[PDB]
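To assess whether the prediction recovers the assembly geometry, we first specified each molecular entity separately, as shown.
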Amino acid sequence: EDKSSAQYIDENCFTWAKFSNDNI
Amino acid sequence: EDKSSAQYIDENCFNLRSTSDSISFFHGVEKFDGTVSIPETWAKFSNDNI
Amino acid sequence: EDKSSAQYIDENCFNLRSTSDSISFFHGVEKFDGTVSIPETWAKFSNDNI
Amino acid sequence: IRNAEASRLWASRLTGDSLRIMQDKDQLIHQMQEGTSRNLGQRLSDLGFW
Amino acid sequence: KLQTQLAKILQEIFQAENTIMLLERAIVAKEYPLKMAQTMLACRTRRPNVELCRDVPQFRLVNEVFTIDDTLQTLKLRLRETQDTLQLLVMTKSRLEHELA
Amino acid sequence: LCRDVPQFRLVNEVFTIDDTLQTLKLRLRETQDTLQLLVMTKSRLEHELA
Amino acid sequence: DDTLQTLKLRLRETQDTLQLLVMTKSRLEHELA
Amino acid sequence: VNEVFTIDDTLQTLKLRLRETQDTLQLLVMTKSRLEHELAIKANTLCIDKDKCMSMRKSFP
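The predicted structure of the complete assembly is given in tokenized form:
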């Protein structure tokens, strides 16, 4: 949900990877 | 200008909160002769400029 | 009764599936040379008795 | 009986040793970390002065 | 008497397991702080020109590296001793239970 | 005294497994400096970018 | 590579067969006597 | 046969008591290790006490 909301914000307007790795 | 570059570097290093981006296991960094001077010499260069 | 004990404490290992509580460190026991005899030897002792 | 008891005392004292070492030396680590941070702060202050 | 001894052996063997897990989580805890000095040094070594400074934070960072390496090696030492103690306790368990039988 | 095929078979397979684990950990103990080399490369390339 | 493990397996098998053979020899000599 | 096994079982029991004896010997190694460990503290305390006691008895007019 966080990622999708960020993507939508990026679309409308115009390390997290490590945390996702730990989640995996 | 050089010392402003220096201040910004030191800022984003000390004020950097860890666990975030720089968590790579650097090694071999236990040796560095990059420093050529002693702070007193740097101070006297600045005084010479003044 | 010797082979009764044999079959009992043999079946409580094959039927005993691996996951248990006795899993805890030992040392290498390659040096173990307890045994002395042969299959044909058990066979022939049984034949002697019968 | 003596085998058992001697082994127990051996293990218990070793455990106590390990716990004490880990705890105190962790405290030392974070102390010197604090020292590093303070020194960096004063260096930044001097640089701003210049 | 022997049965009582067997029971307390079981208690002590899993206590030793608890010690081992304490040691391994100590390893995990000490893994991260090694990042402090090495990353700060790696990023600091880069400066444009002469303002490179030999100073107290640098000395203290060297001390960081030295001390942390000492921490890891002492802790893995403790690891070897705890495994040795556990295997000794287990062979004692085995012998005692066979004469129980 | 259980002297049949299992004892020798197990004795051998445990060796096979530990010899196996030797090279399996060899791979990882090399993967570390495999990481380190790319660490130096990335540090360089970002600095020349600056 | 794998020839190493195969050779060691042949080594152990040859060993075991040798103890088998020698003790069977001793036994057969016992009944012979 | 009966005598052959009577030899063998006696031999393996002797081997078992030999393993017993080696276990006892390593017990003794551990115990003497404990004793020599504590002996250092003994010696240190004794020498420090002796030195200071000599000093204070000799001195303080």
